[PDB]
Amino acid sequence: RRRQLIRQLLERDKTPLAILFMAAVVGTLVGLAAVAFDKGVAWLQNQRMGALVHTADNYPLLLTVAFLCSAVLAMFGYFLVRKYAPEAGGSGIPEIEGALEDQRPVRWWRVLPVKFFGGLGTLGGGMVLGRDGPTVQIGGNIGRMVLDIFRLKGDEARHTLLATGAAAGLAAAFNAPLAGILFIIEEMRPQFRYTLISIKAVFIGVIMSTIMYRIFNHEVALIDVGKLSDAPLNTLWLYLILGIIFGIFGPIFNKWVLGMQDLLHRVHGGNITKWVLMGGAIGGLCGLLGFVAPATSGGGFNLIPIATAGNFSMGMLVFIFVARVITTLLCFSSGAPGGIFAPMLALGTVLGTAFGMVAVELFPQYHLEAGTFAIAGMGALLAASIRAPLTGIILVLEMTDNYQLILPMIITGLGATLLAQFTGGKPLYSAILARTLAKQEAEQ
């Protein structure tokens, strides 16, 4: 196939100006969408704080308005999803991947509103869920919308604009441009066959998305963890030990979410009213735990700098890990709109910090700072649960800027992804697309 390739190499990277320009506008809208979605989620969380003050004396009434405020916002989000867009439940990264396989539709006229407003409800009530899901799905659909509006033709544009949407979408959720592009290249593209996704364009989308986010967010970083210490070579083996711990825990956590989806589906059977009533009990629990023990609730970005700084006791870190594993399953397996990405960072950070603490006390000749082990384990559940280790690495790299930790991060990740493979685990986003594509056939 020599002379074909001779002509193919010659015709390499010449993305049609039409697709390049359309990725430019797609990134800009996904930018504004994620910016607005972010300001929105914050505003309800603030109102919710100011309500607990108008009632800061009658401690039971305090616990009540904390429950009901999140119950109401939760239910609203469940309903908006069951009634008008069922595939905007849960994360939504499984659907955008399916859409790249051409096995699920991009129903943009329905999802943009359902996800955006549905998420504002579940995130804004302080449920343990991430902005990733919402912005990723929302962003891909925004790409289809401009595909349809401008009626561009071809697989290139349909797969590209669908991709450049979800990349710029994950970028704007973490001020994380490189992580976004890498998310498509390692995790979201069609995994078993070639694709025409023009990377130069996904790139133009991520730039514009990131510039919009910088216009509304500069001077404040999502995670400021300072510059930590370096890692001596004779310490690396301790990070691989950490990865092995994640590698067996990774799939163990994947199993629970699948079965917990089942155990919660038994709760409502499929009945839109039992379901929405359940999410008000979940959301109300979260807005309640968010008052009485905030570390067990919320997205989890807040407790990351605190855990890295060694500011928790070892007991507290154990408590938090259990509790946050509990409230993470309750929220994500219920199907409420919102990603799982962000809260898995916290579960990872918390675990590493606990590991770094024990590592500090066993090896004073090593001169450890528990903080480096948090930064390594932060992207670790991403590796052992969703099996996109290269994406978690550049993600944590972008958010904490401790590049001198590049080796223990890479090493703990490969450790988690290898032991997750060898203990019979599956990439979480791909094992969700399955049971979805399998029920979307088992009905026949």
Place this chain on the structure above:
Amino acid sequence: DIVLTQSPAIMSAAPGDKVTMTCSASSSVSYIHWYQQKSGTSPKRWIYDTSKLTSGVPVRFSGSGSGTSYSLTINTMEAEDAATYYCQQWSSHPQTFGGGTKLEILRADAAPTVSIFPPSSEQLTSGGASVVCFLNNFYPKDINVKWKIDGSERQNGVLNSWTDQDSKDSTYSMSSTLTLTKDEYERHNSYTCEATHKTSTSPIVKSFNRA
């Protein structure tokens, strides 16, 4: 914890010459460090991680070993290499240094230039009498001194003080001071000071008489 015992506690060797000291540990040890201390200066980091030189350290130096035994070595020694070499570990906690190994220049033998001094007029008015004897610029450092007062031997009120090896001629000096009260000093006439070396069988007597 982990005891380190450096081996040739003191030692000499001529310039342009191979030198080898030793660190030796009760338990097992990984990657040892070696510092060079000269009399009056801060210790200097000389060799780290079993084997690794430092910027400025001349390449005649070398380290080696493993487990529970390491060593420093100088292929061709120099003069500026005379110091104490301290090994130290941190493979285990807490870290530990060794005892030291003093490296002194070896040279030709030299005999003392002996000087004896009578108590000054100033010290006498205050009431004391110290007779100072200076045994100056010799090698090696083993020596004996004897005091005779009216040619009878004296072993009390004598105190001696050697120097460290010299920088320049790399010899030794040593001072012996007999201290009495003014009264006992005026009871006798001849104060003599006798040095027994290795360069001769017949001591260098120096004395004086008050007359």
Place this chain on the structure above:
Amino acid sequence: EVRLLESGGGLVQPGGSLKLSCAASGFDYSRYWMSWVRQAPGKGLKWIGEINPVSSTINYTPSLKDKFIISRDNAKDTLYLQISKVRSEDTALYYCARLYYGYGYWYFDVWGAGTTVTVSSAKTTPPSVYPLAPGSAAAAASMVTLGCLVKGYFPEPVTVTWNSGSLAAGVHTFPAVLQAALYTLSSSVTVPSSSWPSETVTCNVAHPASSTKVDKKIVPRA
């Protein structure tokens, strides 16, 4: 340059207390661990303790409760060591040191000059400074050997220079010897036969612990 300069060392009464200070100049004093290592007179190097830049974990050798207190002031660029209930075991030269590593087995990177801590009940005392001219029936050789005796001072140390340190060659000051809670030492110069008493050989002693600067002239006897 990179400089570690420590002060605070002196004379202290037993059961008392001192706070040594180490002053840093030439490098970012954070990001580095610091450490104290003392060296008893004529003995090996001994490890006190260490302290990490954020003051969040301090380690001390197997030695008692409040005996040592290592602390640091990153604003001031200075390292502190407080020794409480001082014994005679604590009489030693105290070194300030910055730590580093290579393969991860750590070492003592750059040291400072040191400061000396003397622990005795004996009282500060000035030196008496006596000339050692050669006997009046001298064996006036090619070179003549002069001296001065610096008798009965406390504590250490004295400086002894000759003709303001211009006669730098051919001098030995001897170690002081301690007796009945006092110190004594002598210095020896050697100058050519022609130099003395032609010119003036002077002995300059300085014992700062008692504000003593004295020059003593060596004139020939009789």
